[PDB]
RNA sequence: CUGCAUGGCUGUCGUCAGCUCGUGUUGUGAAAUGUUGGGUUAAGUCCCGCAACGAGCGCAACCCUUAUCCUUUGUUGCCAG
Protein backbone atom coordinates (compact mmCIF):
# COMPACT_ATOMS: atom_id res chain seq x y z
CA UNK A 1 0.00 0.00 0.00
CA UNK A 2 1.22 3.56 -0.93
CA UNK A 3 -0.22 5.20 2.31
CA UNK A 4 1.55 6.01 4.83
CA UNK A 5 -0.61 8.88 6.22
CA UNK A 6 1.82 11.89 6.14
CA UNK A 7 -0.19 14.94 4.92
CA UNK A 8 -3.57 16.59 5.91
CA UNK A 9 -3.20 20.19 4.50
CA UNK A 10 -5.69 21.35 1.79
CA UNK A 11 -4.33 24.87 0.77
CA UNK A 12 -7.55 27.00 0.65
CA UNK A 13 -6.65 30.24 -1.34
CA UNK A 14 -3.19 30.34 -3.07
CA UNK A 15 -1.05 27.71 -4.93
CA UNK A 16 2.15 27.14 -6.95
CA UNK A 17 1.80 25.44 -10.47
CA UNK A 18 5.20 23.67 -9.71
CA UNK A 19 3.12 21.40 -7.34
CA UNK A 20 1.35 19.73 -10.37
CA UNK A 21 3.18 16.34 -9.79
CA UNK A 22 1.24 15.99 -6.46
CA UNK A 23 -2.04 17.93 -7.24
CA UNK A 24 -4.35 16.17 -9.79
CA UNK A 25 -7.39 18.56 -9.65
CA UNK A 26 -8.70 21.64 -7.80
CA UNK A 27 -12.45 22.42 -7.39
CA UNK A 28 -13.95 24.60 -4.60
CA UNK A 29 -11.57 26.14 -1.94
CA UNK A 30 -8.84 23.38 -2.12
CA UNK A 31 -5.48 22.73 -3.83
CA UNK A 32 -5.07 19.29 -2.18
CA UNK A 33 -2.52 16.53 -3.10
CA UNK A 34 -3.03 12.82 -3.86
CA UNK A 35 -3.23 11.23 -0.35
CA UNK A 36 -3.58 7.54 -1.47
CA UNK A 37 -0.20 7.54 -3.42
CA UNK A 38 2.11 9.39 -0.93
CA UNK A 39 5.08 6.90 -0.75
CA UNK A 40 6.41 7.66 -4.35
CA UNK A 41 6.62 11.41 -3.35
CA UNK A 42 9.53 10.63 -0.90
CA UNK A 43 10.67 6.92 -1.24
CA UNK A 44 13.68 7.68 -3.54
CA UNK A 45 14.82 10.65 -1.38
CA UNK A 46 14.62 8.64 1.90
CA UNK A 47 16.36 5.68 0.16
CA UNK A 48 19.27 8.07 -0.72
CA UNK A 49 19.25 9.47 2.87
CA UNK A 50 19.34 5.80 4.15
CA UNK A 51 22.29 5.06 1.72
CA UNK A 52 24.27 8.11 3.02
CA UNK A 53 23.32 7.32 6.68
CA UNK A 54 24.59 3.67 6.23
CA UNK A 55 27.91 4.79 4.54
CA UNK A 56 29.29 6.83 7.52
CA UNK A 57 27.90 10.08 5.97
CA UNK A 58 27.48 13.26 8.09
CA UNK A 59 23.89 14.67 8.19
CA UNK A 60 23.23 18.41 8.80
CA UNK A 61 19.77 19.43 10.16
CA UNK A 62 18.76 23.10 9.52
CA UNK A 63 15.85 24.78 11.38
CA UNK A 64 16.29 28.57 11.97
CA UNK A 65 12.42 28.69 11.63
CA UNK A 66 11.28 29.14 15.31
CA UNK A 67 8.40 26.57 15.22
CA UNK A 68 10.87 23.63 14.90
CA UNK A 69 14.31 25.07 16.05
CA UNK A 70 14.19 23.00 19.31
CA UNK A 71 12.69 19.89 17.55
CA UNK A 72 15.25 19.36 14.66
CA UNK A 73 18.15 18.93 17.20
CA UNK A 74 16.95 15.38 18.17
CA UNK A 75 16.57 12.64 15.48
CA UNK A 76 19.62 10.28 15.71
CA UNK A 77 21.10 8.27 18.64
CA UNK A 78 24.34 6.71 17.12
CA UNK A 79 24.52 8.19 13.53
CA UNK A 80 26.46 11.45 12.76
CA UNK A 81 23.73 14.13 13.24
CA UNK A 82 24.71 17.85 13.37
CA UNK A 83 22.37 20.92 13.67
CA UNK A 84 21.92 24.74 13.23
CA UNK A 85 18.79 26.31 14.79
CA UNK A 86 19.30 29.66 16.70
CA UNK A 87 21.64 31.54 14.27
CA UNK A 88 23.88 31.31 11.10
CA UNK A 89 27.16 33.03 10.04
CA UNK A 90 28.20 34.28 6.55
CA UNK A 91 30.02 31.40 4.74
CA UNK A 92 29.50 28.88 7.63
CA UNK A 93 30.00 25.78 5.34
CA UNK A 94 31.93 27.38 2.40
CA UNK A 95 34.44 29.38 4.56
CA UNK A 96 35.20 26.40 6.93
CA UNK A 97 38.93 27.43 6.53
CA UNK A 98 37.99 30.40 8.84
CA UNK A 99 35.18 28.72 10.95
CA UNK A 100 37.62 25.97 12.18
CA UNK A 101 39.47 28.67 14.22
CA UNK A 102 36.12 29.80 15.84
CA UNK A 103 35.51 26.13 16.87
CA UNK A 104 38.76 26.56 18.94
CA UNK A 105 37.35 29.84 20.44
CA UNK A 106 34.34 27.85 21.89
CA UNK A 107 36.83 26.07 24.31
CA UNK A 108 39.75 28.56 24.44
CA UNK A 109 37.25 31.13 25.88
C1' C B 1 77.37 76.96 -10.79
C1' U B 2 73.28 73.16 -8.87
C1' G B 3 68.16 70.49 -3.89
C1' C B 4 63.65 67.24 -10.67
C1' A B 5 71.07 63.14 -8.64
C1' U B 6 71.96 61.32 -4.03
C1' G B 7 73.14 60.94 1.26
C1' G B 8 72.40 64.16 5.51
C1' C B 9 69.49 67.74 7.83
C1' U B 10 64.35 70.13 8.77
C1' G B 11 59.15 71.11 7.71
C1' U B 12 53.46 70.20 6.22
C1' C B 13 48.22 68.00 4.71
C1' G B 14 48.87 65.11 9.95
C1' U B 15 48.08 62.07 16.32
C1' C B 16 44.96 63.07 11.28
C1' A B 17 41.60 58.07 11.11
C1' G B 18 43.14 56.84 7.48
C1' C B 19 45.00 52.01 4.62
C1' U B 20 44.69 47.06 2.88
C1' C B 21 45.12 41.48 2.81
C1' G B 22 43.66 35.99 3.03
C1' U B 23 39.70 32.75 2.76
C1' G B 24 34.40 32.59 1.19
C1' U B 25 31.01 34.99 -2.19
C1' U B 26 29.83 38.08 -6.64
C1' G B 27 30.58 40.26 -12.08
C1' U B 28 32.36 38.16 -18.91
C1' G B 29 36.01 41.03 -16.58
C1' A B 30 39.06 45.40 -14.72
C1' A B 31 37.10 45.09 -10.10
C1' A B 32 33.46 45.07 -5.86
C1' U B 33 32.49 42.89 -0.89
C1' G B 34 34.28 43.19 4.09
C1' U B 35 35.52 49.01 5.21
C1' U B 36 28.37 49.92 3.50
C1' G B 37 24.29 49.92 7.43
C1' G B 38 22.46 51.14 13.25
C1' G B 39 23.80 53.58 17.95
C1' U B 40 28.31 56.08 19.17
C1' U B 41 33.75 58.02 19.98
C1' A B 42 39.21 61.33 21.08
C1' A B 43 39.23 57.61 16.86
C1' G B 44 38.03 52.13 10.87
C1' U B 45 36.94 53.62 18.93
C1' C B 46 33.34 50.19 20.69
C1' C B 47 28.85 47.25 20.51
C1' C B 48 24.82 45.50 17.25
C1' G B 49 23.69 43.16 12.43
C1' C B 50 23.66 41.27 6.97
C1' A B 51 27.29 37.36 2.17
C1' A B 52 30.74 37.87 4.68
C1' C B 53 34.31 35.65 8.38
C1' G B 54 38.92 36.68 10.23
C1' A B 55 44.03 39.27 10.36
C1' G B 56 47.58 43.33 10.40
C1' C B 57 49.87 48.66 9.98
C1' G B 58 48.34 53.69 12.16
C1' C B 59 45.13 54.07 16.80
C1' A B 60 44.07 51.95 21.76
C1' A B 61 47.07 50.14 25.95
C1' C B 62 51.94 50.92 27.68
C1' C B 63 55.85 55.68 28.55
C1' C B 64 57.98 60.91 30.82
C1' U B 65 55.40 64.46 34.01
C1' U B 66 51.52 67.29 37.56
C1' A B 67 47.50 68.41 42.15
C1' U B 68 47.37 65.12 47.53
C1' C B 69 48.37 62.19 51.84
C1' C B 70 51.56 58.70 54.58
C1' U B 71 56.91 57.59 55.69
C1' U B 72 62.08 59.01 56.05
C1' U B 73 67.15 62.09 55.59
C1' G B 74 68.84 67.23 56.49
C1' U B 75 73.22 72.04 55.43
C1' U B 76 75.52 78.65 57.02
C1' G B 77 67.84 77.61 54.21
C1' C B 78 63.58 76.48 58.30
C1' C B 79 62.67 77.09 64.53
C1' A B 80 57.79 73.54 65.41
C1' G B 81 59.13 70.15 69.77
From Swiss-Prot:
GO terms for molecular function: structural constituent of ribosome; zinc ion binding. The modification N6-succinyllysine is found at residue 107. GO terms for biological process: cytoplasmic translation; ribosomal small subunit assembly. GO terms for cellular component: cytoplasm; cytosolic small ribosomal subunit. Signal peptide: none annotated. Part of the 30S ribosomal subunit, contacts bS1. Some nascent polypeptide chains are able to cross-link to this protein in situ. In collided ribosomes contacts ribosome rescue factor SmrB. Required for ribosomal protein bS1 (rpsA) to bind to the 30S subunit. This is Small ribosomal subunit protein uS2. It comes from Escherichia coli (strain K12). The gene is rpsB.
